Amino acid sequence: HFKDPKRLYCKNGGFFLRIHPDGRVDGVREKSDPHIKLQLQAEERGVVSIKGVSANRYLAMKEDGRLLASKSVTDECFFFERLESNNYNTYRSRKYTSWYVALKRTGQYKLGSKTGPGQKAILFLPMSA
Template sequence: MWKWMPLAAGPLPAAASASTSPASPRASSLCLACCALLLATSSVLGGCPGGTVPSPEPTRVQEGANCSWSLDRHARSYNHLEGDVRWRRLYSATKFFLRMDKTGKVDGTRRKNCINSVMEIRSVSVGVVAIKSVNTGLYLAMSKKGKLFGSEEYNHNCKFKERIEENGYNTYASLRWKQKGRQMFVSLNGRGTPRRGHKTRRKHLSAHFLPMLIS
């Protein structure tokens, strides 16, 4: 009598043997050639099929442009840059124009076209200015006691901190001198007479000036 054997058990050793058999030299050479062709193609296309991945260079350019724009805006935010020169008439909130005569006297005048009221305002550092009479050539200065006078020479007494107040007027405080820790300001009272620095405050209208364009 015939004895039947399972068919599934027979082919397994042959399959296992085929999978573990070494590849022929011709097959290995063909595989290496294919790999070399793929590498060459990817290098020509920029490392990706079809070259669809965008280059990172435009992103860096854009970031650089934004950075440059931020720096320019930061620089433009400073209204008083060193070397800036303006010709103005300083009109006080008490309705006087600040003036200096040839003797060095400082006071106020209501005359709109007074030649001694034309001032050259020069920025010597950020937020610090020197104020010079165009006609007399004298510099506005403040003494240790807070008295205003015209100085022939430019020195530390001639430096003032310029600040734009909330009402749109400017204040000018002595950079060098203070009175008991308080700043002393250029100021004209209701009669056009300069007030002593130790009696002035930032909030006083007599210390507020509007730089007016020369017409």
């Protein structure tokens, strides 16, 4: 269901994208984590905002390519959601158009400035919740 929340399971290590109520962004393998339920909303065809339901914040990528979640929306909270040909999803920042949202195999995000098309850190699998 497009209206129900989703969990974003990153191919790189099985970490679910998580938004802390304080704004920190990282990953957790624990499916029961209280901060992995995300509400993806389209702002228009192919473009979404990603909102941590519990943290009530928006995943935004700053200019240096670091992730964090704002309390209110900004032009940096929009990403191109794309269902790749491998069936994984990629969230490319609409602002810094060459970077993606990604997690390291250690549960911490990866600087967009370090993200790239051939990488496993960028691939995400949406899951119901």
